Amino acid sequence: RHKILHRLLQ
Amino acid sequence: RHKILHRLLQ
Amino acid sequence: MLSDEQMQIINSLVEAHHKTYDDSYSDFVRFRPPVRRLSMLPHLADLVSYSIQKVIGFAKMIPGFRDLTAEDQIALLKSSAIEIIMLRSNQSFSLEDMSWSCGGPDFKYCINDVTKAGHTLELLEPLVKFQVGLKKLKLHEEEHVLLMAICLLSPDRPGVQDHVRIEALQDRLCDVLQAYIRIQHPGGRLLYAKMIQKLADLRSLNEEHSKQYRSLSFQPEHSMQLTPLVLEVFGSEV
Amino acid sequence: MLSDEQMQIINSLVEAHHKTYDDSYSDFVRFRPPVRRLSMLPHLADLVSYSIQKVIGFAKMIPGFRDLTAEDQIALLKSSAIEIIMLRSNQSFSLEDMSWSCGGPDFKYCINDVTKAGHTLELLEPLVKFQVGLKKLKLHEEEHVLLMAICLLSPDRPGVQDHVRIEALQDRLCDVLQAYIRIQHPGGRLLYAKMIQKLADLRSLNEEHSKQYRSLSFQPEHSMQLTPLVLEVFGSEV
Ligand SMILES: C=C1/C(=C\C=C2/CCC[C@@]3(C)[C@H]2CC[C@@H]3[C@@](C)(O)CCCC(C)C)C[C@@H](O)C[C@@H]1O
Ligand SMILES: C=C1/C(=C\C=C2/CCC[C@@]3(C)[C@H]2CC[C@@H]3[C@@](C)(O)CCCC(C)C)C[C@@H](O)C[C@@H]1O
């Protein structure tokens, strides 16, 4: 579920 | 479903 | 003449780009080294992964992007990432070499190097002609960054939900750009139209890249050389 | 005295290990360079990923492993991979430096370098004492490879189905090892017991590594620096 994208988007 | 492992195990 | 709101937008986008594009390219030494089958895939996988992080950072500083829902931010980045990378790479592209030159011979990428990452001329021919024509426009950095933001904030992407909000944001940036060219770019009478055509070219380049990325990702021997971020962004998950 | 079957097994395992452990370490230059937060995680992620591929290649040449079902082969590799890596790394470990020395100062890993990949002394203290005690056994390469195969073919791993088949295979290798020490290793009266204790130590090292890998993998900022193969092998999927 887009774990890296979510984190980088903060 | 362990796509890399399967391929490397041939 | 430009308003304080339009002008503030340009300031924000130029600073955002300066914060996320490092002209020294000193970080490139941290990538898996280039090797000149698919010998260049490790190095270019790291280059693209590093560039996705920069595009995420650029997007976060676009006025209004952060205010979108996380789902829309993801939808926009997944569809547009490869296009923004192709746009932003023009800054290292060189007409005399027909190559991307990133501060040193080890980080000079020619057409042949990219074939060594799995790509055929069906992608590399239009990609290089795209870089050439974009370089010939001799865009001001103000226009370069507006075009990246306009590309990013395109509402006609699969997965977008708040189409109306994103279209308004994109319309504002398009008006900034059209105005800027009118007042600040002499001889720019036909420039706005040519830049919009470049956005259409990117859609076709996106389509071809997705075909060839699909080939790579269906072979675990090669997909294992990618990075987690690349697999997530270029992946098909919803 | 050893039989032709036992002896053939030793031949197969030694050749398998020679084919999958390159004493020149020349491939290490292809990893993301070492940097001395978590500056060593990229380089050590690539080292481990490269090593997992070698352990897979070693396992495929163990007599009987290929004949297991794919599901059992995966179950064994996912549970044992980190243990085989810890075992096989003893060949580069050095008692005078208390470090792993891989043909050059850039590829010399001390305790401090490993802390720069997220690990605490709860793992590094037992790991280094394990390397020391294993190095003091001064194993013949025949014994070193038998111990890796015995570790790999352990039936008491989660997910294993054909427990009976894998136990028989492991019993055969244990008998080869015990015999070999009896006939070929002078002063090896207590060696078999000490090696089996090392297998128990590895279980505890495995447990501690899994805790600390769980920390790393739950933070996307760090898990994104791993490789697809590492995420798949050290991951919890079934
Ligand atoms: C990425 C950037 C730069 C170069 C970009 C290049 C040259 C090399 C080839 C590139 C990257 C091409 C853009 C897409 C293409 C590409 C089609 O093989 C990418 C495919 C990736 C692969 C893993 C499937 C350098 C600098 O300007 C920074 C900028 O962000
Ligand atoms: C991997 C090998 C070698 C060294 C291994 C080392 C030294 C460095 C630290 C290592 C790798 C440790 C074993 C586990 C540990 C480790 C606990 O941080 C690994 C954790 C990985 C991270 C991504 C979570 C060199 C050579 O003998 C080849 C052999 O296969």
Numbering used by the authors:
A (entry chain B1), B (entry chain B1): 686 to 695
C (entry chain A1), D (entry chain A1): 155 to 190, 251 to 452
Relevant lines from the article:
The classical pathway of vitamin D3 (D3) activation involves two key steps: 25-hydroxylation to produce 25-hydroxyvitamin D3 [25(OH)D3], and 1α-hydroxylation by cytochrome CYP27B1 to produce the active 1α,25-dihydroxyvitamin D3 [1,25(OH)2D3]. This natural ligand of the vitamin D receptor (VDR) regulates expressions of various genes including that encoding catabolic CYP24A1 through the VDR. In addition, D3 can also be activated by a novel metabolic pathway initiated by CYP11A1 (P450scc) producing 20S-hydroxyvitamin D3 [20S(OH)D3] as the major product. Here we present the high resolution X-ray crystal structure of 1,20S(OH)2D3 in complex with the VDR, as well as further characterization of its biological activities.
To characterize molecular interactions in order to understand the mechanisms underlying the differential VDRE stimulatory effects, the Danio rerio VDR (zVDR) ligand binding domain (LBD) was crystallized in the presence of 1,20S(OH)2D3 or 1,25(OH)2D3. When compared to the zVDR LBD-1,25(OH)2D3 structure, the Cα atoms of the zVDR LBD–1,20S(OH)2D3 complex have a root mean square deviation of 0.25 Å over 238 residues. The ligand binds similarly to 1,25(OH)2D3 with the notable difference being that the 20S-OH forms a weak H-bond with His305 (3.42 Å) and does not interact with His397 (note that the residues numbers correspond to hVDR). An additional difference in the structures is that the 20S-OH forms a Van der Waals interaction with Val300. While most of the Van der Waals interactions are maintained, the side chain and terminal methyl groups that are differently positioned to interact differently with some of the residues. Weaker interactions are formed with Leu227 (4.1 Å instead of 3.8 Å with C26) and Tyr399 (4.1 Å instead of 3.8 Å with C27), interactions compensated by stronger interactions with Val234 (3.9 Å instead of 4.2 Å with C22), and Leu412 (3.9 Å instead of 4.2 Å with C27). Overall, the hydrogen bonding interaction of 20S-OH with His305 and hydrophobic contacts formed by the ligand explains its agonist activity, however, with less potency than that of 1,25(OH)2D3. The crystal structure of 1,20S(OH)2D3 bound to the VDR reveals differences from the 1,25(OH)2D3-bound form with respect to their interactions, including the important role of the H-bond between the 20S-OH and His305 that shifts the position of this residue compared to the 1,25(OH)2D3-bound form. Compared with 1,25(OH)2D3 and 22-oxa-1,25(OH)2D3 (22-Oxa), two known VDR agonists, 1,20S(OH)2D3 showed potent transcriptional activity with EC50s of 450 nM in HaCaT cells, 285 nM in Caco-2 cells and 19.1 nM in Jurkat cells.
